[PDB]
Scaffold this active site. Structure first.
Site, PDB file in Angstrom:
ATOM      1  N   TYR A 286       0.803  -1.211   0.000  1.00 38.19           N
ATOM      2  CA  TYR A 286       0.000   0.000   0.000  1.00 38.19           C
ATOM      3  C   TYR A 286       0.839   1.266   0.000  1.00 38.19           C
ATOM      4  CZ  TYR A 286      -3.407  -3.574   1.043  1.00 38.19           C
ATOM      5  OH  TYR A 286      -4.202  -4.700   0.942  1.00 38.19           O
ATOM      6  N   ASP A 288       0.435   4.502   0.716  1.00 40.49           N
ATOM      7  CA  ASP A 288      -0.562   5.340   1.389  1.00 40.49           C
ATOM      8  C   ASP A 288      -0.549   6.785   0.847  1.00 40.49           C
ATOM      9  OD1 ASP A 288      -0.274   3.635   4.660  1.00 40.49           O
ATOM     10  OD2 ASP A 288      -1.358   3.090   2.852  1.00 40.49           O
ATOM     11  N   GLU A 291      -0.756   6.296  -3.769  1.00 38.12           N
ATOM     12  CA  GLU A 291      -1.986   5.642  -4.269  1.00 38.12           C
ATOM     13  C   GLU A 291      -3.246   6.200  -3.600  1.00 38.12           C
ATOM     14  OE1 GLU A 291      -0.816   1.534  -3.449  1.00 38.12           O
ATOM     15  OE2 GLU A 291      -0.262   1.188  -5.554  1.00 38.12           O
ATOM     16  N   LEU A 293      -3.414   8.978  -1.142  1.00 33.18           N
ATOM     17  CA  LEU A 293      -3.364  10.413  -0.857  1.00 33.18           C
ATOM     18  C   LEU A 293      -3.649  10.662   0.615  1.00 33.18           C
ATOM     19  CD1 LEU A 293      -5.178  11.977  -4.025  1.00 33.18           C
ATOM     20  CD2 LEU A 293      -2.818  11.078  -3.740  1.00 33.18           C
ATOM     21  N   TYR A 372      -5.112   1.628   9.280  1.00 31.64           N
ATOM     22  CA  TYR A 372      -3.942   2.354   9.819  1.00 31.64           C
ATOM     23  C   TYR A 372      -4.320   3.769  10.210  1.00 31.64           C
ATOM     24  CZ  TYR A 372      -1.849  -0.825   6.296  1.00 31.64           C
ATOM     25  N   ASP A 373      -3.654   4.296  11.245  1.00 35.14           N
ATOM     26  CA  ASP A 373      -3.730   5.723  11.549  1.00 35.14           C
ATOM     27  C   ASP A 373      -2.314   6.198  11.798  1.00 35.14           C
ATOM     28  OD1 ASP A 373      -6.175   4.244  12.605  1.00 35.14           O
ATOM     29  OD2 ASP A 373      -7.014   6.267  12.628  1.00 35.14           O
ATOM     30  N   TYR A 374      -1.949   7.308  11.167  1.00 28.32           N
ATOM     31  CA  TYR A 374      -0.591   7.807  11.274  1.00 28.32           C
ATOM     32  C   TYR A 374      -0.586   9.263  11.668  1.00 28.32           C
ATOM     33  CZ  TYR A 374       0.580   3.937   8.052  1.00 28.32           C
ATOM     34  OH  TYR A 374       0.769   2.714   7.445  1.00 28.32           O
ATOM     35  N   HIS A 421       5.205  -7.083   7.921  1.00 21.22           N
ATOM     36  CA  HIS A 421       5.215  -5.978   6.968  1.00 21.22           C
ATOM     37  C   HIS A 421       6.120  -4.876   7.469  1.00 21.22           C
ATOM     38  CE1 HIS A 421       2.210  -4.993   9.982  1.00 21.22           C
ATOM     39  NE2 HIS A 421       2.487  -3.728   9.729  1.00 21.22           N
TER      40      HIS A 421
HETATM   41 CU   LIG Z   1       2.566  -2.137  11.115  1.00 21.62          CU
END
Ligand SMILES: [Cu+2]
Ligand SMILES: [Cu+2]
Ligand code: NA
Ligand code: NA
EC number: 1.4.3.21
Lengths: 618, 617
Positions: A286, A288, A291, A293, A372-374, A421
């Protein structure tokens, strides 16, 4: 009125209107990307240009379009051959299309019936396709689907992955191209509902409050919407739907001179490659940023829990799929925080005891990309240090845990797996150390042999190797020899006649692990090496190229580097690869505690002495 | 009640009394080290104190263990210091180097050659090490480097006198050697960081940041030094050699108090210098082992050193005569906000969730001549344990040679800073769910594209158990993401996997000196990133009990030679981590903080996240 100001609602409305009066934005056309272009070098009256990627829901070829909002014109418009240059970023409105299509496909329904799964309860993640062995996907806009059962509206579907099953879909033609069922795996049954008292237990009553306040307000000022002045620093906070928060014109007021340091800082790409060789997930990578945005999915951040203290928020405006402006309310947090001791010495001989406090300016945003949260944090320190930190959290991407174990998946709960990953970031640092004439040296510690000139065998030293041309500027980490990279200005000397510089300090985490002949190694070539240096060009924005989705490889950094341009005392760009290698742990389930990765740059003979002698006693 | 409680003034006074009563603390005797011992494994109470007693008339020193509970001397042994090492440097000996040199005709001639007034020449009392001077063996020697102080409030570090070094016997009070290799200019610029001329007008742009806790802190202190905070339990000790020591680090998981670390300390710290000049090539400061970092702990001022709601401990140490001396507010304890703990906004469920992190901070700050170091231990909500060293102070200076140097940086006209390292040893006496532990080395494993991995995307990891001490001396490999996991092979989580903690190192360079050097032998621990030993109660420091003027032969290499079983045993992890310092102009005239450290994170210790019970803010 600053040419680096954030895009206004009116500006976006106008590119919409220009694309209308000009004939490119009817129904069936949909904006996959829209952002303002940075001013050109030397120009600085203003000309505000926006760049737009236009998709065709009626199946016609997409367009790349540049518009001038200042003059009300189309600068350029070109038709895209997506098979050649790559597909446009995933659209938000396609997030549901994978599920909706599959729900009426007999092969999919048959796979669900075999596992006794109610189709109304099966969520399907819209997952980027990449480029593998499927000839029919070339030129086609494909999303792949992995299934997760949601037991009830508020249930966490990530607890119930449906393994052994994957679907491929064309989101323009609305067709299901393939359904792959390699065999049933038990669907893990435990829930992962981290707000359920059954799972949380009684909530702690032991935390007493921590109040952080500034009775006189913050020490930074915000002018022209996004210009920050704080403790000798000045910069402009930009925002882009692809990159997220972007920092412009990072400079430091040394006495009376405003000294540039970094012209532009961003996270220009980030990729999440999966290391499970099962055909169900082995295609999974992915991008992020490129692809999906990441800016478009930035959270609206609430006071007192996302951002604590005296916070100044920016609310950036972006485009929806039709060109209407959409505000991300409180999408960017800006605050200053205490950072412990800056400098301290208690001198026996002088009798003088001295202590000073450090602080840092924080500019952040938080984004959510599926599970996911970043958080993306930029920090400026009193002493001239610049730092980036990514905070990774959310819910881990799950699968079944195989009977008899796995070399490529972790067990989280009974029957529940988490494939291995990485999350790998690319920081693009358009350097301007005392202006644009810069160069980069690789610095290694040098051990010395005991002998003549070093009779006690205590000596150690350093060596610096100038990176002269792009062909020599693809570098790897060497933690053992304390390897760092210095960006200097060979025509700007400090008072000791040494070129002024900043030193990049990397964490030296592993780079991309995939086999060098893999699809992901070619498409995310940037992630295979820790440090790249290129000559600046206006069209070299991302390490993976402009169109990452289903693009075959070599795009971006490896094609740029091949130009072999002079970078020894020129306008250059640093690209630092850094990431997290994640072998999920039981403690990551059902919701992941934050983990971090990052880098920093420290002054290295940039100043003539400490720049914080004038900080007062607290 | 607790046998891990801090030494009280009464206990130290009683140790004095027991020693006097036994004839071991007459008027020529001085205490060079005094500390409480930890209770024996499986231990009512017996508070024992260990003492190194120096004799100012030249008689041999002694190592003594006292039981303060029972009023008895447990053991007393005379030391042959030529064999086993000299006692730590005594604070009273610091001034001795300057004082003896001031009336030495060789020293005065060297100063007169440089037109320097002896009344203005400060002399740094520097540890001697072990080199080529046969006469030093069995003698307490300090070496002296000179710095000019232009007036009482001047920073002398600005004005190093290069080309000159002296060696002094601090017991016989003799100058043994004065080496003058030639005059270097004494740099002239002052380094006075409170002088308005250098600082310029002080900033008026910093607005207040106020950190308060209206309902008080979330941690409790009981029995003087027992901390309970957000599931964590520990005892905060203090030793003059080591400084803050953490005992009995445990975590209350539901009903069960689960041990993690039995004892955590910084057991050694060395500062080797990389300038091959005969004037400094002997310089290696073992701040912990030679100088005793705890004894120089600063009294920390409310609101300046520690911001927020602070609880202080005031540990008591012994002076040279066995009288108790309090280090007022020498240990800071506070909790602080640490950003986001966990966050997810879920599209399918519609649930948005955010929780804040916090950490408990236990710290002290010491000053060792020109250097000042902060030692910080952190406990996080999620089970993470971290250490951070903050290095500041004024850099150690020299002349900057005309025509430059491969081993010294220029700071100011004529002013140099020799290259050096600051290298720490963390001694972690592990107790992951109790004492039956083992250590695995974990590397990332790359996989080749082919059968089983047709797309070449697979990657994995491998763990190698360190079974005996002979296999337990390990190096970093940043490239392969190398870490070390401490687990309990008899305690399994609900997924039937051994519970564990993973050590994450910074992978900074280790000791750079040639392996044939004196420092490589004396600081052997610093040459490798990770060592594991079998616990023994006399294996306390990686450099042995007596580091001052002591050659190789003690410490970790001697311990490791026993080749004991460490596979499911009571083990101790020793992690070497350091900063390699090429000083920069920005470090002058007073150094901004730089940091180094390590952490340990739970690795299948818990049955799921341990912070699901943290409430919304
Ligand atoms: Cu991870
Ligand atoms: Cu240093
Ligand atoms: Na540049
Ligand atoms: Na142990």
């Amino acid at each position: 009125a600053s040419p680096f100001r954030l895009a206004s609602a009116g500006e976006i409305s106008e590119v919409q209107g220009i694309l209308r009066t000009a004939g490119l934005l009817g129904p069936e056309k949909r904006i996959a990307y829209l952002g303002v272009l940075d001013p050109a070098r030397g120009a600085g009256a203003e000309d505000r240009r926006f760049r737009v990627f236009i998709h065709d829901v009626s199946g016609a070829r997409p367009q790349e379009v540049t518009v001038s909002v200042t003059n009300g014109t189309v600068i350029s418009a070109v038709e895209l051959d997506t098979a050649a240059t790559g597909e446009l970023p995933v659209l938000e409105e396609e997030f549901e299309v994978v599920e909706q299509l599959l729900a009426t496909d007999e092969r999919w329904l048959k796979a669900l019936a075999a596992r006794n799964l109610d189709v109304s309860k099966v969520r399907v993640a819209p997952l980027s396709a990449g480029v593998f062995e499927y000839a029919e996907e070339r030129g086609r806009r494909i999303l792949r689907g992995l299934a997760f059962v949601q037991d009830f509206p508020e249930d966490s579907a990530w607890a119930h992955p449906v393994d052994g099953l994957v679907a491929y879909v064309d989101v323009v033609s609305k067709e299901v191209t393939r359904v792959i069922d390699t065999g049933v795996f038990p669907v893990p049954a435990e829930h992962g509902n981290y707000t359920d008292p059954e799972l949380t237990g009684p909530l702690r009553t032991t935390q007493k409050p921590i109040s952080i306040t500034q009775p006189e307000g913050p020490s930074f000022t915000v002018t022209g919407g996004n210009h920050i002045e704080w403790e000798k620093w000045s910069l402009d906070v930009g925002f882009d739907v692809r990159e997220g928060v972007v920092l412009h014109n990072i400079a430091f007021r040394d006495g009376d001179r405003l000294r540039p340091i970094i012209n532009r800082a961003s996270i220009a790409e980030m990729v999440v490659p999966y290391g499970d060789p099962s055909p169900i997930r082995s295609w999974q990578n992915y991008f992020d940023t490129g692809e999906y945005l990441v800016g478009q999915y930035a959270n609206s951040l609430e006071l007192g829990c996302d951002c604590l203290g005296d916070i100044t928020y920016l609310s950036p405006v972006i485009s929806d799929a039709f060109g209407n402006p959409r505000e991300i309310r409180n999408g960017i947090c800006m605050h200053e925080e205490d950072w412990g001791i800056l400098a301290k010495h208690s001198d026996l001989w002088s009798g003088i005891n001295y202590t000073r406090r450090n602080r840092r300016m924080v500019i952040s945003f938080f984004t959510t990309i599926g599970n996911y949260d970043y958080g993306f944090y930029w920090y400026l320190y009193l002493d001239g240090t610049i730092e980036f930190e990514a905070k990774a959290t959310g819910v881990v991407f799950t699968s079944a845990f195989p009977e008899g174990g796995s070399d490529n998946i972790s067990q989280l709960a009974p029957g529940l797996g988490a494939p291995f990953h990485q999350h790998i970031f690319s920081a693009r640092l358009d350097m301007a150390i005392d202006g644009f004439t810069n160069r980069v040296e690789e610095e290694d510690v040098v051990r010395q042999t005991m002998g003549p000139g070093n009779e006690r065998g205590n000596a150690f030293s350093r060596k610096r190797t100038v990176l002269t041309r792009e062909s020599e500027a693809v570098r790897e980490a060497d933690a053992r020899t304390g390897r760092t990279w210095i960006i200097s200005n060979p025509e700007s000397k400090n008072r000791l006649n040494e070129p002024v510089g900043y030193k990049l300090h990397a964490h030296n985490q592993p780079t991309l692990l995939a086999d060098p002949g893999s699809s992901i190694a070619r498409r995310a070539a940037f992630a295979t090496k820790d440090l790249w240096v290129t000559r600046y060009a206006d069209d070299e924005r991302y390490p993976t190229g402009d169109f990452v989705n289903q693009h075959s490889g070599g795009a971006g950094l490896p094609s740029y580097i091949a130009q072999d341009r002079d970078i020894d005392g020129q306008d250059i760009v640093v690209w630092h690869t850094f990431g997290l290698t994640h072998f999920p742990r039981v403690e990551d389930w059902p919701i992941m505690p934050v983990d971090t990765v990052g880098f920093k740059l420290r002054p290295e003979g940039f100043f003539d002495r400490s720049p914080v002698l004038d900080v007062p006693a607290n």
